[PDB]
Design a binder for this molecule. Structure first.
Ligand SMILES: *[C@@H]1O[C@H](CO)[C@@H](O[C@@H]2O[C@H](CO)[C@@H](O)[C@H](O)[C@H]2NC(C)=O)[C@H](O)[C@H]1NC(C)=O
Ligand SMILES: *[C@@H]1O[C@H](CO)[C@@H](O[C@@H]2O[C@H](CO)[C@@H](O)[C@H](O)[C@H]2NC(C)=O)[C@H](O)[C@H]1NC(C)=O
Ligand SMILES: *[C@@H]1O[C@H](CO)[C@@H](O)[C@H](O)[C@H]1NC(C)=O
Lengths: 337, 48, 211, 48, 186, 49
């Protein structure tokens, strides 16, 4: 989010803007804080998705020793690079981006977004587009499918996918023969588990609530900031023009000062709230970047870090303002005393 | 409203109250005044 | 040679310590902003308390002084909240640095990309203004060769699997090698284990496992 | 006074005024509006 | 045009335009949730006029640094390159601003209209981020501000096979530096 | 507040009440920001635990 402090507190009033100058650097400090948050959001995405700078091309076939990656890999013969699951993830988070004329010819079409723009409130686009993030996730998965865990430690080294899975089995204390003797059963269990993920999100909503909550919080914060302009804060009116038109400068300045103080405090409250939310998201992004490095580029032995059970491998999927990890785990199912 | 701004303003409704008082009782024709005129003859609202 | 390249890598190219310089610059800017806020009048007739007290009597002076007290208290409150926010970001960096000191310097990390890129061997800490610089020593595979491979070797009717490494064929002969470094060793009943029969493993190849 | 900037002269002058700095580093800056100022006054009262 | 207005005592600054909004019989002005007067009925013609802020669109200035060049590129956010002269009221601006209202170097991005930067088909690492995948640099095409789609990295196709493995034959001991803040000024 | 309302008429009382509302709202706003800061430090400790 970006805020024009003078347009929010004083609009186009020269009298109010001259009084606002008496407050010194408050507006400039507020803009520097919001600009720092905006740069941090692009850095968060870069740290989580841009870990490998090699864009491994999607393999033509999505079949590897019977393992089917068709639901998590780019769709074949599709210029866009979004995976079938990613297509759903983007459809489950509901979302500004209004053009110049979209707020001009509005007959009883007043919208909170136009009020945000007319009061100095702007939304900056992300540096990385959704298609660029989908290209990073596709590169990470394609690398994992062919190279293995080597593309995160140096030169990508080709390995047959069954063999890659045999290594991952011996990592969790299971002999490689168990994988080779049961290869068709394991491939079928993996394929069925990925298929259940499709519905698990489609059939049941609230799956992406953590991402929806971040969107809802930001929208609510901006809508609250706009509505604070209707507060008089002890002044005779919330409208600067009503004060300037009815009062002479000495008496008008006292009423304008009450509006400047209340609006500056509303904006200062908003910026502190945004900074608090930005670090909680930075912490989530740093944890996501660590999970990308340890769960996707490697094999984790940390208990419950990459899903519940013995971690074999993980696949990243791009989502609005976030990432969804698909943790593949081995769980003992039947036991004998 | 500032007297200097009256020539630049327009009003939806204007009411004219007219009466006669003694010179020393003109001060009571104002908000928050206490006196025989302000108490029992003509009172203005505090938000006049 | 790698440690020697570190000397210039920082000397030759500036902005190497930008993360530490940014922390210093932020603090300086915050203090300079707080001092300059004293020149703001915040709706008072003057930013100078002495000008208000010398020209106005207490009842009228108090109203002007109160406007300065409120604006200056708010400037100081803004500064302290900003400092607390920056302090936790630095606390988080310090906790991560303490964890890297324990896991990368006092131990050997297997966590991917935690102690530098590549296979972590060891790390050395170096002191810096308001911070720490870690020198991560890592092993990176540099040259590679393509080999024909198989999941298992079939001897008689028994499936033989590599205990460690992978089966590789130079072109006519099969050998076992470790995964990260090419060291071909003759397949023996000491570097392989037997599990099941050759009829279950897909891609098994027939060869001789001697003793 | 050693230097001066007309904030409404050009986009670089406006960036300098927005940042309150005669020196601007490499980057992108969202500027405060300082280029458009009303040149005329429109007064519209009823036919009274 | 951006004008100071006075309608029946109600004053303000903004652009007056023809309105498609419909007013009630005695309504004289319209306001939004922000309490901004967005519309007014002219007391002489009885025509409803929309009141727009004199500058509501966001303008970003791209510079390679005053020490490197005084050349700048201007990004008009969410504005089409055809509407930039009306959106920023170029006729009321200085001749210096009017140069950035039009030109041969006008490129439409998802972030808005970029004026003053030459668009190239070549892909480079991001230097000055603009948004929507577009970045700018002060490259030499005299040096000029150039806009381009940022590179995501080098392309690499792994030759996957069911019976081939790549094994390292050599290695390199690498030493990397990690810089971490630990404390701030007390 | 009762001392202000009992001795002053609404126009003059409102100016004094507004000074109390602003100071008390600022005291409460300071408290809530302090609590949010402490809450994340505890969230970080809880995530580590
Ligand atoms: C991976 O699984 C998908 C889903 O089962 C396979 O594609 C679908 O297959 C069904 C049955 O033939 C068709 O009705 C769908 O239209 C297919 N969907 C798509 C998008 O093609 C897919 O063929 C499998 N891939 C491999 C290599 O086995
Ligand atoms: C106020 O008077 C003006 C005329 O002085 C009216 O406007 C004119 O109306 C005639 C008849 O419709 C038009 O031919 C003119 O072009 C109008 N303008 C001028 C400049 O003469 C106006 O309608 C009146 N307003 C009201 C509310 O009665
Ligand atoms: C392996 O790398 C080292 C260091 O570059 C070099 O001296 C040596 O000759 C290399 N060996 C081969 C077989 O290329």
């Amino acid at each position: 989010t970006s805020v024009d402090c003078t347009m929010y507190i004083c609009g186009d009033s020269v009298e109010c803007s001259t009084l606002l100058l008496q407050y010194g650097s408050f507006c400039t400090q507020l803009n520097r804080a919001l600009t720092g948050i905006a740069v941090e959001q692009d850095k968060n995405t870069q740290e989580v998705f841009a870990q490998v700078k090699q864009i491994y091309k999607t393999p033509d076939i999505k079949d590897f020793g019977g393992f089917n990656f068709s639901q998590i890999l780019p769709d074949p013969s599709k210029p866009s690079k979004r995976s079938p699951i990613e297509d759903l993830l983007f459809n489950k988070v509901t979302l500004f981006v209004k053009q110049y004329g979209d707020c001009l010819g509005d007959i009883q079409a007043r919208d909170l977004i136009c009020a945000q723009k007319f009061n100095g409130l702007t939304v900056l686009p992300p540096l990385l587009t959704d298609e660029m993030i989908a290209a990073y996730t596709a590169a990470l998965i394609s690398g994992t499918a062919t190279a293995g865990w080597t593309f995160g430690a140096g030169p990508a080294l080709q390995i047959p996918f069954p063999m890659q899975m045999a290594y991952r089995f011996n990592g969790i204390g299971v002999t490689q023969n168990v994988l080779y003797e049961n290869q068709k059963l394991i491939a079928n269990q993996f394929n069925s588990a990925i298929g259940k993920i499709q519905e698990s999100l489609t059939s049941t909503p609230s799956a992406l609530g953590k991402l929806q909550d971040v969107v809802n919080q930001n929208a609510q914060a901006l809508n609250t900031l706009v509505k604070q302009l209707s507060s008089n804060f002890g002044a005779i009116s919330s409208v600067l023009n009503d004060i300037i038109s009815r009062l002479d400068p000495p008496e008008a300045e006292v009423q304008i000062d009450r509006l400047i103080t209340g609006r500056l405090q509303s904006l200062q409250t908003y910026v502190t709230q945004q900074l608090i939310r930005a670090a909680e998201i930075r912490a989530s992004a740093n944890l996501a970047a660590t999970k990308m490095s340890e769960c996707v580029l490697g094999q984790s032995k940390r208990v419950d870090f990459c899903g519940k059970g013995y971690h074999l491998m993980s696949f990243p999927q791009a989502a609005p303002h976030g990432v969804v990890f698909l943790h593949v785990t081995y769980i003992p199912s039947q036991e004998r005393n | 409203v500032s007297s200097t701004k009256l020539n630049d303003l327009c009003f939806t409704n204007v009411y004219a109250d007219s009466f006669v008082v003694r010179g020393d009782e003109v001060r009571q024709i104002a908000p928050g005044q206490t006196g025989v005129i302000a108490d029992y003859n003509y009172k203005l609202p505090d938000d006049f | 040679s790698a440690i020697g390249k570190i000397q210039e890598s920082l000397t030759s190219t500036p902005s190497a310590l930008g993360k530490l310089q940014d922390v210093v610059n932020q603090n300086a800017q915050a203090l300079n902003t707080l001092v300059k806020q004293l020149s703001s009048n915040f709706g008072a007739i003057s930013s100078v308390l002495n000008d208000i007290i010398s020209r106005l009597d207490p009842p009228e002076a108090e109203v002007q002084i109160d406007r300065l007290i409120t604006g200056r208290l708010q400037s100081l409150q803004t500064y302290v909240t900003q400092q607390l926010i920056r302090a936790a970001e630095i606390r988080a960096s310090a906790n991560l640095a303490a964890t890297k000191m324990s896991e990368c310097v006092l131990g050997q990390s297997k966590r991917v990309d935690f102690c530098g890129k590549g296979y972590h061997l060891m790390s050395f800490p170096q002191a810096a203004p308001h911070g720490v610089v870690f020198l991560h020593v890592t092993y990176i595979p540099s040259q590679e060769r393509n080999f024909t491979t198989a999941p298992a070797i079939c001897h008689e009717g028994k499936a033989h699997f590599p205990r460690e490494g992978v089966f590789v064929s130079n072109g006519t002969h099969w050998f076992i090698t470790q995964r990260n470094f090419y060291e071909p060793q003759i397949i023996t009943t000491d570097n392989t284990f037997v599990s099941g029969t050759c009829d279950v493993v897909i891609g098994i190849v027939n060869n001789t496992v001697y003793d | 006074i050693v230097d001066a900037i007309d904030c409404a002269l050009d986009p670089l002058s406006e960036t300098k005024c927005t940042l309150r700095s005669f020196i601007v580093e490499k980057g992108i800056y969202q500027t405060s509006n300082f280029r458009v100022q009303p040149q005329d006054t429109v007064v519209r009262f009823p036919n009274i | 045009k951006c004008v100071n207005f006075n309608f029946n005592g109600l004053t303000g600054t903004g652009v007056l335009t023809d309105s498609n909004k419909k007013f009630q019989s005695f309504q004289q002005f319209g306001r939004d949730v922000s309490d901004f007067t967005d519309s007014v009925k002219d007391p002489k013609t009885l025509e409803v006029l929309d009141i727009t802020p004199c500058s509501y669109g966001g303008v970003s200035v791209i510079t390679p640094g005053t020490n490197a060049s005084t050349q700048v590129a201007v990004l008009y956010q969410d504005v089409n390159c055809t509407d930039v002269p009306t959106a920023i009221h170029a006729e009321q601006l200085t001749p210096s601003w009017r140069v950035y209202s039009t030109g041969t170097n006008m490129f439409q991005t998802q972030a808005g209209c970029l004026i003053g930067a030459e668009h190239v088909n070549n892909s480079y690492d991001c230097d000055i981020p603009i948004g929507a995948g577009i970045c700018a640099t002060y490259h030499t095409p005299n040096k000029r501000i150039v806009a381009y789609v940022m590179s995501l990295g080098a392309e690499n196709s792994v030759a996957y096979s069911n019976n081939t493995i790549a094994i390292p034959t050599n290695f390199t001991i690498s030493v990397t530096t990690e810089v971490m803040p630990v404390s701030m000024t007390k």
